[PDB]
Symmetry: C3
Subunit: 335 residues, 3 copies
């Protein structure tokens, strides 16, 4: 169909780690699904010792919100760059075809907005990110990325075509940060975004992140902000990394079905311990919880997780199952 003649619907986005309400399988025909995002440059505290990042975001969060459509829908995004920001921005959708993913059609200076439509003709999770000419990696590593999820119209399927369903989706964006230090060995704090640029590029070129965080900060997805589930619930874990490889893992769980390259027309793999999200992509894993307790969800380069920040928690309620795991003898003196 011709999109100019199709029904339009508007979606209200929600902040990560939640994902806006949506259908999996749907009886709906194709639609033009309208979204708006407003860019916010802001200084953020990214660790427990007061380190700040001169950050750049879609909609005020790292990652930006996840946008969900169905295959054959059109995405119609209005991108707003308020006059309170300093930099130009745009958006590149890996789910889109042409014009550098839309970036060439969405260059907005502070004070401007633009509206892009594209056909979401390929199913999968896809990164979107800012990509202004001449300063692409800086905008990405400063926070400007998120996920577009294009569901098959009949929902997710296993390799034999059997339906897969989730009860809850969570979106995790993983951010390799390049925060400069000064000659005193302390992280720098900058009064403006522009002042951070040159020093940050030098750190970037070392390819060594200072921090690697989920969802904007060390510990973002812990404590009151842990992810939650129950025994018996199936969760979809969407993982985006717009710049650098990562290897997600659920400690004490598995990826029951995983699309690590993130593209739902391909059969998923089962029983994964650790999967691989290529830098510049989003992938997705399903898991049905079978044990209660506090899980970790992390990048299984354990230095990247525990030393640099790429780890969160999932608090799961329900009944312990001694068939799956039992302590036969508790720690006690060696006989």
């Amino acid at each position: 169909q011709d999109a100019d003649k199709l029904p339009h619907t508007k979606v209200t986005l929600v902040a990560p780690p939640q994902v806006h309400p949506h259908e999996q399988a749907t009886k709906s025909g194709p639609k033009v699904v309208e979204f708006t995002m407003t860019i916010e440059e802001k200084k953020m505290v990214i660790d427990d010792k007061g380190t700040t990042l001169q950050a750049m975001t879609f909609n005020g969060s790292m990652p930006g919100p996840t946008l969900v459509v169905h295959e054959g829908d059109y995405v119609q995004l209005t991108l707003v760059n308020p006059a309170t920001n300093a930099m130009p921005h745009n958006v590149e959708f890996h789910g889109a075809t042409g014009a550098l993913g839309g970036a060439k059609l969405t260059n907005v200076n502070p004070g401007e907005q633009a509206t892009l439509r594209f056909k979401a003709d390929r199913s999968g999770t896809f990164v979107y990110h800012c990509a202004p000419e001449g300063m692409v990696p800086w905008h990405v590593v400063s926070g400007m990325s998120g996920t577009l999820m294009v569901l098959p119209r009949d929902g997710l399927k296993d390799p034999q075509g059997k339906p897969l369903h989730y009860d809850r989706a969570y979106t995790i964006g993983e951010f390799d940060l390049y925060i400069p230090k000064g000659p005193d060995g302390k992280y720098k704090d900058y009064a403006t975004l522009a002042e951070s640029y040159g020093d940050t590029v030098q750190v970037m070129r070392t390819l060594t992140p200072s921090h690697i965080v989920f969802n904007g900060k060390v510990g973002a997805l812990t404590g009151a902000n842990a992810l939650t589930a129950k025994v018996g619930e199936t969760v979809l874990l969407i993982h985006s990394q717009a710049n650098r490889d990562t290897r997600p893992h659920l400690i004490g769980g598995h990826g029951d079905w995983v699309w690590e390259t993130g593209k739902f027309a391909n059969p998923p793999q089962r029983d994964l311990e650790t999967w691989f999200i290529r830098g510049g992509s989003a992938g997705a894993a399903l898991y049905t919880f079978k044990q209660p307790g506090v899980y970790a969800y992390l990048n299984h380069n354990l230095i990247e997780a525990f030393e640099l920040g790429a780890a969160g928690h999932i608090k799961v309620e329900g009944k312990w199952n001694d068939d799956l795991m039992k302590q036969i003898k508790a720690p006690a003196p060696i006989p």
Copy 2:
């Protein structure tokens, strides 16, 4: 079945690179398979110039021994932490479900042991590793990991369901080491394990290994300690990397059938030149030798292999096959 009512068998572990005797396909029903491992902290010489590592091991080796069961069996491990060690330890099994892979149920201080049971309900090679709260990557990178192999009850299969069989299994654990240097440019030698901690964490956070070794040392799997095979023999090469990505390769061979994500319910890929083991996982490759000679088996980041240590040898006996490869003209002056 209820594991409390199933038959128990005990397995005697063997040191890497061998793997304890086991069946592939079996007529046996599910069993509770009992293993014991004893933690040994020890100083190890890890290269040819006398560099030492304040190491931590399961059963005295890097990697720990490979444990082999069949899908539907239960693993029942007694983990012993003698009083001669300095640190607490535990074990996390990626093949297990719940309680942080078992780590929460196996915290043993020096002088203690504990016994864990879990259902091995998913086929594949899976990493196990130590994970004590607050010092997880240090224990892993100091040597505390190995593989659990859960074979399908009817043995390995190709993508069409045809049986695959191996004559010999070898287990290779690859270890990214973070050995500190002092201000004189020499690697540090520490009198105790605890004294090594702070300096090692700083090196870890650079994400640059000093050494990357197979099986505990540069050259571990070379010379008298080369792996061996014959023309016509099919070998299974199990490769674990509990912390960091690697890319195994057999020079002059291939991965005939490879499960790079390591999970046997998924179809393997064929004819691989180089495969990919995500940090935090174990994978497996089958190869049937067709030529004699000394092969290298290595990580094909060739700097990681030849400069940092991640390479071994396979000495293969038998008859050379000029159909597969022939020197037509030996090196000689250019006409």
Copy 3:
């Protein structure tokens, strides 16, 4: 068949990024396909500020030329090392079986040549590279690698066995460079290849490239040297990385069908945003262009691409398609 009795054909190689003319599906039976390559050591300017590399090449280019045969053919390569070079060289073919991929049979000192035959019995793209004993990574990272493509005799196929065809093939070799700096912070320029060795090994061991280039230089595949296509044309993008992982991506496009591990007997994946070439391998992607414009083809570690060099351009002619993408509202003041 016995290769000694088969027909021989000679192929004239062409420089990257082109690939010599070849059939996809063929009615031909197996042949011994003869190639010659001549090693050239030379100083190359690799960036826009005059940095030089003491380089090493097959046939004068980075990468070496792509060699194309069909499964069941034999490759018969004459490798020539002129007396004007300083170092010994050889060749290792990942597509070959035995004798360290051929390296043991092709050790040529300056002034020598050798001829190797092997059976190309496995379909796929495969790296070939130099591997002289004791200095393997140096020769690889200095430029000595390329691709052997072994096509199935009936051409490429999708997961259901349907024929896939390309109109044009391009070959991209990605090179992680390790150029030393002196104490003044400037890149070193060396009068000879041998003088560069020790300093380069120290940089290599940091695992941090100074530059990461396609096809020999920052910007090699841009401007007059951009890749070209038209709307409606299907291109095969061959990507080799003999030493280090990379993650190819076509901005504004996709991998329609991708063999990221590069082995054509395995089913390809569809709709990829970003794929993964393991260090030590070659992979291949098909894409049919649907929009005109200047695309980027890059490594989607965006620092590696935009800061270090791993990016090129594809200039595509034809008609813009507003169904796939349309600017609904151009950048304008915020209402």
